[PDB]
Design a protein around this motif. Structure first.
Motif, PDB file in Angstrom:
ATOM      1  N   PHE A  34       0.848  -1.192   0.000  1.00  0.00           N
ATOM      2  CA  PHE A  34       0.000   0.000   0.000  1.00  0.00           C
ATOM      3  C   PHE A  34       0.884   1.243   0.000  1.00  0.00           C
ATOM      4  CE2 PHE A  34      -4.391  -1.484   1.700  1.00  0.00           C
ATOM      5  CZ  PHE A  34      -4.362  -2.563   0.838  1.00  0.00           C
ATOM      6  N   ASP A  35       0.739   2.077  -1.025  1.00  0.00           N
ATOM      7  CA  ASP A  35       1.694   3.144  -1.315  1.00  0.00           C
ATOM      8  C   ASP A  35       0.943   4.470  -1.419  1.00  0.00           C
ATOM      9  OD1 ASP A  35       3.742   4.785  -2.168  1.00  0.00           O
ATOM     10  OD2 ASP A  35       3.991   3.809  -4.114  1.00  0.00           O
ATOM     11  N   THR A  36       0.991   5.287  -0.362  1.00  0.00           N
ATOM     12  CA  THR A  36       0.350   6.600  -0.421  1.00  0.00           C
ATOM     13  C   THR A  36       1.158   7.617  -1.225  1.00  0.00           C
ATOM     14  OG1 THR A  36       1.325   7.328   1.686  1.00  0.00           O
ATOM     15  CG2 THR A  36      -0.812   6.200   1.779  1.00  0.00           C
ATOM     16  N   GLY A  37       2.255   7.194  -1.848  1.00  0.00           N
ATOM     17  CA  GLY A  37       3.055   8.035  -2.710  1.00  0.00           C
ATOM     18  C   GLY A  37       2.861   7.808  -4.192  1.00  0.00           C
ATOM     19  N   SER A  38       1.968   6.904  -4.584  1.00  0.00           N
ATOM     20  CA  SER A  38       1.682   6.669  -5.991  1.00  0.00           C
ATOM     21  C   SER A  38       0.196   6.381  -6.128  1.00  0.00           C
ATOM     22  CB  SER A  38       2.542   5.535  -6.563  1.00  0.00           C
ATOM     23  OG  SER A  38       2.154   4.275  -6.050  1.00  0.00           O
ATOM     24  N   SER A  39      -0.260   6.263  -7.377  1.00  0.00           N
ATOM     25  CA  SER A  39      -1.696   6.215  -7.628  1.00  0.00           C
ATOM     26  C   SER A  39      -2.086   5.137  -8.631  1.00  0.00           C
ATOM     27  CB  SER A  39      -2.195   7.577  -8.109  1.00  0.00           C
ATOM     28  OG  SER A  39      -1.833   8.585  -7.186  1.00  0.00           O
ATOM     29  N   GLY A 193      -0.210  16.164  -6.415  1.00  0.00           N
ATOM     30  CA  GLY A 193      -0.817  14.852  -6.377  1.00  0.00           C
ATOM     31  C   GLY A 193      -0.469  14.017  -5.164  1.00  0.00           C
ATOM     32  N   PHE A 194       0.349  14.534  -4.255  1.00  0.00           N
ATOM     33  CA  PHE A 194       0.792  13.808  -3.076  1.00  0.00           C
ATOM     34  C   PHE A 194      -0.013  14.229  -1.851  1.00  0.00           C
ATOM     35  CE2 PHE A 194       4.866  13.945  -5.572  1.00  0.00           C
ATOM     36  CZ  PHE A 194       4.896  12.598  -5.869  1.00  0.00           C
ATOM     37  N   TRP A 195       0.104  13.428  -0.790  1.00  0.00           N
ATOM     38  CA  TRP A 195      -0.342  13.837   0.542  1.00  0.00           C
ATOM     39  C   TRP A 195       0.758  14.715   1.134  1.00  0.00           C
ATOM     40  CZ3 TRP A 195      -5.187  12.914   2.475  1.00  0.00           C
ATOM     41  CH2 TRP A 195      -5.959  11.945   1.825  1.00  0.00           C
ATOM     42  N   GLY A 216       6.852  18.308   3.103  1.00  0.00           N
ATOM     43  CA  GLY A 216       7.144  16.928   2.757  1.00  0.00           C
ATOM     44  C   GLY A 216       5.867  16.154   2.510  1.00  0.00           C
ATOM     45  N   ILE A 217       6.036  14.898   2.104  1.00  0.00           N
ATOM     46  CA  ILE A 217       4.903  14.052   1.755  1.00  0.00           C
ATOM     47  C   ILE A 217       4.848  12.864   2.702  1.00  0.00           C
ATOM     48  CG2 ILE A 217       4.963  14.773  -0.636  1.00  0.00           C
ATOM     49  CD1 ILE A 217       6.057  11.784  -1.150  1.00  0.00           C
ATOM     50  N   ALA A 218       3.625  12.435   3.010  1.00  0.00           N
ATOM     51  CA  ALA A 218       3.391  11.238   3.812  1.00  0.00           C
ATOM     52  C   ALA A 218       3.311  10.051   2.861  1.00  0.00           C
ATOM     53  CB  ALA A 218       2.108  11.378   4.627  1.00  0.00           C
ATOM     54  N   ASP A 219       4.303   9.162   2.926  1.00  0.00           N
ATOM     55  CA  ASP A 219       4.499   8.129   1.908  1.00  0.00           C
ATOM     56  C   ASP A 219       4.728   6.778   2.579  1.00  0.00           C
ATOM     57  OD1 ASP A 219       5.038   6.576  -0.270  1.00  0.00           O
ATOM     58  OD2 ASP A 219       6.791   7.711  -0.943  1.00  0.00           O
ATOM     59  N   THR A 220       3.667   5.972   2.671  1.00  0.00           N
ATOM     60  CA  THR A 220       3.807   4.621   3.206  1.00  0.00           C
ATOM     61  C   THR A 220       4.664   3.729   2.318  1.00  0.00           C
ATOM     62  OG1 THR A 220       1.781   3.854   2.129  1.00  0.00           O
ATOM     63  CG2 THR A 220       1.569   4.818   4.338  1.00  0.00           C
ATOM     64  N   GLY A 221       4.869   4.103   1.058  1.00  0.00           N
ATOM     65  CA  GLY A 221       5.646   3.309   0.132  1.00  0.00           C
ATOM     66  C   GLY A 221       7.139   3.548   0.156  1.00  0.00           C
ATOM     67  N   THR A 222       7.617   4.415   1.040  1.00  0.00           N
ATOM     68  CA  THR A 222       9.035   4.716   1.175  1.00  0.00           C
ATOM     69  C   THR A 222       9.487   4.267   2.555  1.00  0.00           C
ATOM     70  OG1 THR A 222       9.105   6.550  -0.407  1.00  0.00           O
ATOM     71  CG2 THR A 222      10.726   6.576   1.381  1.00  0.00           C
ATOM     72  N   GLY A 301      14.935  16.001  -4.119  1.00  0.00           N
ATOM     73  CA  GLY A 301      14.159  17.171  -4.469  1.00  0.00           C
ATOM     74  C   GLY A 301      12.863  17.335  -3.708  1.00  0.00           C
ATOM     75  N   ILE A 302      12.515  16.393  -2.836  1.00  0.00           N
ATOM     76  CA  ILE A 302      11.318  16.503  -2.015  1.00  0.00           C
ATOM     77  C   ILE A 302      11.580  15.748  -0.721  1.00  0.00           C
ATOM     78  CG2 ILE A 302      10.264  14.515  -3.152  1.00  0.00           C
ATOM     79  CD1 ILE A 302       7.535  16.053  -2.717  1.00  0.00           C
ATOM     80  N   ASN A 303      11.040  16.265   0.378  1.00  0.00           N
ATOM     81  CA  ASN A 303      11.191  15.606   1.668  1.00  0.00           C
ATOM     82  C   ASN A 303      10.130  14.524   1.812  1.00  0.00           C
ATOM     83  OD1 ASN A 303      13.364  17.346   2.641  1.00  0.00           O
ATOM     84  ND2 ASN A 303      11.794  18.947   2.788  1.00  0.00           N
ATOM     85  N   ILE A 304      10.516  13.379   2.372  1.00  0.00           N
ATOM     86  CA  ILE A 304       9.632  12.217   2.411  1.00  0.00           C
ATOM     87  C   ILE A 304       9.539  11.698   3.837  1.00  0.00           C
ATOM     88  CG2 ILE A 304       9.141   9.914   1.539  1.00  0.00           C
ATOM     89  CD1 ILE A 304      10.796  10.615  -0.922  1.00  0.00           C
ATOM     90  N   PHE A 305       8.340  11.768   4.412  1.00  0.00           N
ATOM     91  CA  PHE A 305       8.049  11.158   5.705  1.00  0.00           C
ATOM     92  C   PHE A 305       7.627   9.723   5.420  1.00  0.00           C
ATOM     93  CE2 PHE A 305       8.372  14.657   8.682  1.00  0.00           C
ATOM     94  CZ  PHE A 305       8.335  15.758   7.847  1.00  0.00           C
TER      95      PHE A 305
END
Ligand SMILES: NCc1ccc(C(F)(F)F)cc1
Length: 330
Positions: A34-39, A193-195, A216-222, A301-305
């Motif tokens: 489950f990846d909140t960083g892609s669609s 397009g990100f959270w 930054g973005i909330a990304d369960t996929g990272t 280029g982007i911060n990732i939580f």
């Protein structure tokens, strides 16, 4: 309606989490990331190049009485780590923990990058970012969450990731027994397009909190936590013998060291990441150098939580017309 599914780490380092998903009629159960960083919802299938499949469970549309080829549609995706996959598109019934969507776009992989091939535990990805990032052409497709939104009790889903332990993805309701205290909500920008949200600052160990805006973005996929170079340098400066390694590609530290905690701000609230969450173990079997879970975003280029940060909290993804992100301690 609601849905609830258990998510499980794929290995002892919590490199990723897999969740069982039922696709087709009769159900074919695949374990998806489950990846909140892609669609995109894409799966290994009977159409994947046979040399590119090594132990994964494959989706077979010809055995599903509800599968329909989406004529002429294709997809192609490339992730921030260089991974890639592509293929054609079916529609089918998809169920997550009792929550069923009909006519969900299921993207069948014909080609997958070597990264996915050598990971036998992940059968595909289920994207949970905003549908504007979906790669299906010429007709863009909606995510599972977007399709389920209407029938959900509330237009939310929650991520409760475990530390070396199973966790829970819930759809349509907030489990008020899964967290402590209050949930602090913060504004989300959907422009990319990100959270995407703004953290209010950070602290290293028991040090002073530094008020500063971190987008930054909330990304369960990272897997890891990727933050600006100034913040990451301040963290690793507190670990004796830590250094940035060019051959390894990030900060490493002596495995004998104990790591300080890392705090990040959500509005006026604070989320504390225990130091143990930042230890990702020896860089190679038998090595006394260990890999750090907090790394610099300068090359990205982007911060990732990523999971390192999200698994320290109960996280609400509120997909209302004005989307917000909720964080609570647990
Ligand atoms: N987990 C999906 C993902 C991976 C990479 C990126 C990047 F690199 F574009 F930020 C975003 C989202």
């Amino acid at each position: 309606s609601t849905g609830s599914a258990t998510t499980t780490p794929i290995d002892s380092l919590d490199d990723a989490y897999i969740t069982p998903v039922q696709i087709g009629t009769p159900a074919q159960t695949l374990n998806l990331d489950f990846d909140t960083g892609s669609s995109d919802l894409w799966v290994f299938s009977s159409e994947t190049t046979a040399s590119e499949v090594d132990g994964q469970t494959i989706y077979t549309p010809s055995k599903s009485t509800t599968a329909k080829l989406l004529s002429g549609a294709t997809w192609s995706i490339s992730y921030g780590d260089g991974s890639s996959s592509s293929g054609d598109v079916y529609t089918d019934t998809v169920s997550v923990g009792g929550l069923t969507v009909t006519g969900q776009a299921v993207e069948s992989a014909k080609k997958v990058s070597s990264s996915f091939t050598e990971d036998s535990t992940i059968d595909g990805l289920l994207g949970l970012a905003f549908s504007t990032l979906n790669t299906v052409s010429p007709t863009q497709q909606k995510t599972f969450f977007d399709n389920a939104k209407a029938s959900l009790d509330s237009p939310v889903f929650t991520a409760d990731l475990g530390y070396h332990a199973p966790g829970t993805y819930n759809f349509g309701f907030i489990d008020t027994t899964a967290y402590t205290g209050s949930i602090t909500y913060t504004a989300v920008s959907t422009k990319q397009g990100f959270w995407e949200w703004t953290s209010t600052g950070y602290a290293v160990g028991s040090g002073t909190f530094k008020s500063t805006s971190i987008d930054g973005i909330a990304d369960t996929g990272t897997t890891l936590l990727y933050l600006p170079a100034t913040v990451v340098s301040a963290y690793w400066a507190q670990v004796s013998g830590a250094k940035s390694s060019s051959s390894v590609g990030g900060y490493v530290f002596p495995c004998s060291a104990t790591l300080p905690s890392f705090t990040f701000g959500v509005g006026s609230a604070r989320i504390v990441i225990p130091g143990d969450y930042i230890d990702f173990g020896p860089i190679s079997t038998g090595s006394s150098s260990c890999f750090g879970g907090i790394q610099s975003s300068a090359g990205i280029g982007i911060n990732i939580f990523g999971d390192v940060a999200l698994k320290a909290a109960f996280v609400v993804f509120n997909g209302a017309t004005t989307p917000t992100l909720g964080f609570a301690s647990k």
